[PDB]
C-alpha cells in the first residue's frame, strides 16, 4: 500500500458481515489500533446486539475540546454507557438497522471510522472558530491582528495523543495551523525518519505541490507553542508544522483533510518500515550482481544431463 486506510478494517468487515447476516453468531473481540488505541467488540447480552467500545489514553483531553457533542451528533440513538476500561461506547441492534444496503454500508463505515471521529473534535473546533474569526476580520481588517494574537493562545488545542507525539493546533482568521511535536524512539527509525522528515519539507518547496498546506520543520519549537506544557526544545523532538489555509478545509474537503492530517505520523512510521523491505530488495539485487563476479572464478565444465527431479538421464 502507498497510503494507510483511515478506518479500522476489522470493524468495517465484521459489521458489513453482521449487517447482512441471516443468523448472527456471538463475538468477544478486543482489537488493537495505532497510537495505543484499542476497541472491544462484543455481544454482551444477545447475539442480536453488538457493543463497540473505544479505549484511548488522550480521551479526557478530547472531551475538553467538544468530543462528546460530536460523537452524539455522529452516532445519535446508538450511543451507550461506557464499558468498564473503555472511554466511549456504541450499541448497535441488528434488528434495528436502516432499510437499505447503502445506509447499512455507511453505518458500518461510520462505526469503523470511530478512532478518527473521536480525534476530529479539536479540528472541527478550530475550523468552526476560524469561520467566526474570518467573519470578524472581514468586518474590520485592522482589528484582525489582535484577534489572531489572542486566538493563538486562548483558542489553542494541545493533544498529548501518544507519549512521543503532541499535536498542537489553533485557528487564526485565514488558517488553521497544526504542529506535530514528533519523535521516533527506535534508533533505526530515528535514522531513517531524519531522511523522511527532511525530504517531506523539501517536497513542499517544489512547483508540483504548491497547492498543499504550507509545511515547516525544526528540531527549536515554533514560537507560539514554546510554552505549551509537555513541549521541550532539547528532548530529541522534531516539529512538523502544517498551515492549512481556507482552501484546505472548504466545506467539500473538511472531513478528508481531518482524516488525512491525523494519519500524518502513521504514514511516516509505516513508510519508514516499508523502506526497509525496499532497501532489502535493493541489496539482494546486487548480491546477485556480485555472484557474477565470483562465477568467473568457477572453471568451465559440462554437468551431466538430469531430469526435472534431478535423476540422471541417458540420451544425446
Amino acid at each position: 500500500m502507498l497510503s494507510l486506510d483511515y478506518n479500522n478494517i476489522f470493524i468495517y468487515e465484521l459489521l458489513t458481515e453482521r449487517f447482512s447476516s441471516e443468523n448472527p453468531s456471538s463475538i468477544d473481540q478486543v482489537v488493537t489500533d495505532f497510537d495505543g488505541v484499542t476497541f472491544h467488540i462484543s455481544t454482551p447480552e444477545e447475539k442480536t446486539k453488538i457493543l463497540i467500545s473505544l479505549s484511548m489514553k488522550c480521551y479526557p483531553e478530547l472531551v475538553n475540546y467538544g468530543t462528546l457533542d460530536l460523537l452524539k451528533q455522529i452516532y445519535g440513538a446508538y450511543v451507550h454507557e461506557p464499558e468498564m476500561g473503555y472511554n466511549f461506547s456504541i450499541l448497535i441492534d441488528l434488528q434495528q438497522l436502516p432499510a437499505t444496503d447503502e445506509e447499512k454500508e455507511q453505518l458500518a463505515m461510520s462505526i469503523s471510522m470511530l478512532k478518527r471521529n473521536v480525534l476530529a473534535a479539536p479540528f472541527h473546533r478550530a475550523f468552526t472558530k476560524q469561520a467566526e474569526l474570518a467573519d470578524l476580520a472581514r468586518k474590520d481588517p485592522e482589528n484582525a491582528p489582535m484577534l489572531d494574537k489572542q486566538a493563538t493562545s486562548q483558542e489553542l488545542m494541545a493533544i498529548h495523543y501518544r507519549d512521543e507525539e503532541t499535536i498542537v493546533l489553533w485557528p487564526e482568521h485565514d488558517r488553521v495551523t497544526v504542529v506535530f511535536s514528533t519523535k521516533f524512539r527506535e534508533e533505526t527509525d530515528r535514522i531513517f525518519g531524519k531522511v523522511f522528515l527532511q525530504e517531506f519539507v523539501d517536497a513542499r518547496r517544489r512547483p508540483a505541490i504548491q497547492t498543499a498546506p504550507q509545511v515547516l520543520f525544526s528540531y527549536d519549537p515554533p514560537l507560539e507553542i514554546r510554552d505549551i506544557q509537555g513541549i521541550q526544545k532539547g528532548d530529541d523532538f522534531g516539529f512538523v508544522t502544517f498551515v492549512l489555509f481556507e482552501r484546505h478545509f472548504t466545506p467539500q474537503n473538511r472531513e478528508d483533510c481531518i482524516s488525512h492530517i491525523q494519519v500524518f505520523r502513521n504514514t511516516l512510521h509505516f513508510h519508514i518500515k516499508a523502506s526497509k523491505a525496499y532497501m532489502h530488495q535493493r541489496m539482494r539485487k546486487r548480491v546477485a550482481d556480485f555472484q557474477k563476479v565470483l562465477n568467473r572464478a568457477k572453471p568451465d565444465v559440462e554437468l551431466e544431463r538430469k531430469t526435472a527431479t534431478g535423476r540422471s538421464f541417458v540420451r544425446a
Binding site: E142, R205, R206, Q214, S218, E224, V243
Partner: protein, 370 residues
C-alpha cells in the same frame, strides 16, 4: 464644470471638480497585442487602454507611458487622455477647463508638452497643472505641513507653511510602487515563483497590494519569520495555482526605508522627510513635525504610518510631538485636493486661458503654474 485629472505613473484618477471622489480610476496603461490574430470579424482592435488592456493582458505587451513621474511616450499619453475624456469620463474636453497634476522637480519640457496637447489636441477652454503634493494639503483642510507623497513612479516631499511652500527644501526620490513591484518580482524568484512578462508584472502588483505590509522593526519581523507560521500567506494566481510567501511581504516595502535593497544610494523616506524638515527655517520645524501628511497608493501598506512615526521620532529631538496624518482616503487625496482647488472661489483667475496660451505658446505654463 471643470475637470480634475491626476496623471498617475501607475493609475489615472479623473473626475469633475466639486465631486467627493474620482469618477474614473483606471490603469495608466496602453496594451499592444503580441500574438498574430487569426479570427477575422470577431472584434480585434489594434491597441487597448486602461481596464480593457488590464482585462485582455494575457495576449498583450502592456506599457506605462509615464515612468518616474515623466511622460516617456506622448503618443500613448494622447491615447490615455482621449480614453479619459471620451470613453471613461464621457465628456467633451472642448468645453470643460482641466486641472492636471504634476510631480515637483520634473523636466521643464514635461510641463510644456502637457499644456500644448491640452490646447492644440483636446481644445480645452483653460487648464492648470498643480504640484501633486500641495493638493494633498488642500484635501486634509490644512495650510501647514510636510507631505510625503508616494504613488507608483516617485516619492516626493514638499514642506509648506501658512500656504507658502519652501522650494529649496522640496526633494524627490525615484523609488515608489513600480520599483517595489520590480523588487517583489526579484524576491518572489527565490521561493521559485518566476514572474517575467509585463502581464505577470500586474499579478505581482496585485500580490504587493494584497499581501505586503511594513515591519515596525525589520530585524524583529525577520526573526519572527524564522518561526514563520504566523507570517506565511497563500495567494492564488489567475491559473488557479498558488504561491505562499513570508518575509517577502515586508522585505518589499522596507526598500522605502532601506533603498540599498535595490542598490540605490539614497536616504529612506523617514530620513528624507527628516532631511527636508531640517532644510526648513528653525521655528517652522515644530509645526511640520506635528503635520506629516501621507499620500498616494505607496503609503497604503499596513504598518507604514506607525513605522514612519517611530523612525522620525528616532531622528528628531524628543522635545516636540510628531504625528503622521495618514487618512483612509489617502490614495485619492491628490485628486480630492484638485477637486477643492478647481472649485475654490478665488482660483478662477489662476487658470491658463486658451487666448493666454495662443498669445505666448507652451512656455506660458512656467510663468503662472508654480
Amino acid at each position: 464644470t471643470a475637470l480634475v485629472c491626476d496623471n498617475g505613473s501607475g493609475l489615472v484618477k479623473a473626475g469633475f471638480a466639486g465631486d467627493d471622489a474620482p469618477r474614473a480610476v483606471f490603469p495608466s496603461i496602453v496594451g499592444r497585442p503580441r500574438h498574430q490574430g487569426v479570427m477575422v470579424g470577431m472584434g480585434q482592435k489594434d491597441s487597448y487602454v486602461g481596464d480593457e488592456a488590464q482585462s485582455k493582458r494575457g495576449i498583450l505587451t502592456l506599457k506605462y507611458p509615464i515612468e518616474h513621474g515623466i511622460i516617456t511616450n506622448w503618443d500613448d499619453m494622447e491615447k490615455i487622455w482621449h480614453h479619459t475624456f471620451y470613453n471613461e469620463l464621457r465628456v467633451a474636453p472642448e468645453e470643460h477647463p482641466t486641472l492636471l497634476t504634476e510631480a515637483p522637480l520634473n523636466p521643464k519640457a514635461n510641463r510644456e508638452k502637457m499644456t500644448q496637447i491640452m490646447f492644440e489636441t483636446f481644445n480645452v477652454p483653460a487648464m492648470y497643472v498643480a504640484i501633486q503634493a500641495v493638493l494633498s494639503l488642500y484635501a486634509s483642510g490644512r495650510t501647514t505641513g510636510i507631505v510625503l507623497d508616494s504613488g507608483d513612479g516617485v516619492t516626493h516631499n514638499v514642506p509648506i507653511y501658512e500656504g507658502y511652500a519652501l522650494p529649496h527644501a522640496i526633494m524627490r526620490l525615484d523609488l515608489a510602487g513600480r520599483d517595489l513591484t520590480d523588487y517583489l518580482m526579484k524576491i518572489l524568484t527565490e521561493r521559485g515563483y518566476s514572474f517575467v512578462t509585463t502581464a505577470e508584472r500586474e499579478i505581482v502588483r496585485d500580490i504587493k497590494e494584497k499581501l505586503c505590509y511594513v515591519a515596525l522593526d525589520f530585524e524583529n519581523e525577520m526573526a519572527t519569520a524564522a518561526s514563520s507560521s504566523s507570517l506565511e500567506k497563500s495567494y492564488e494566481l489567475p491559473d488557479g495555482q498558488v504561491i505562499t510567501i513570508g518575509n517577502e511581504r515586508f522585505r518589499c516595502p522596507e526598500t522605502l526605508f532601506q533603498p540599498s535593497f535595490i542598490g540605490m544610494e539614497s536616504a529612506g523616506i523617514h530620513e528624507t522627510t527628516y532631511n527636508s524638515i531640517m532644510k526648513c527655517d528653525i521655528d517652522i520645524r515644530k509645526d511640520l513635525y506635528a503635520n506629516n501628511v501621507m499620500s498616494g497608493g505607496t503609503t497604503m501598506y499596513p504598518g507604514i504610518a506607525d513605522r514612519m512615526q517611530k523612525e522620525i521620532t528616532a531622528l528628531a529631538p524628543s522635545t516636540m510631538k510628531i504625528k503622521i496624518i495618514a487618512p483612509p482616503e489617502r490614495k485619492y487625496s491628490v485628486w480630492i485636493g484638485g477637486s477643492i482647488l478647481a472649485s475654490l472661489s478665488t482660483f478662477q483667475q489662476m487658470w491658463i486661458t486658451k487666448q493666454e496660451y495662443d498669445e505666448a505658446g507652451p512656455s506660458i505654463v512656467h510663468r503662472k503654474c508654480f
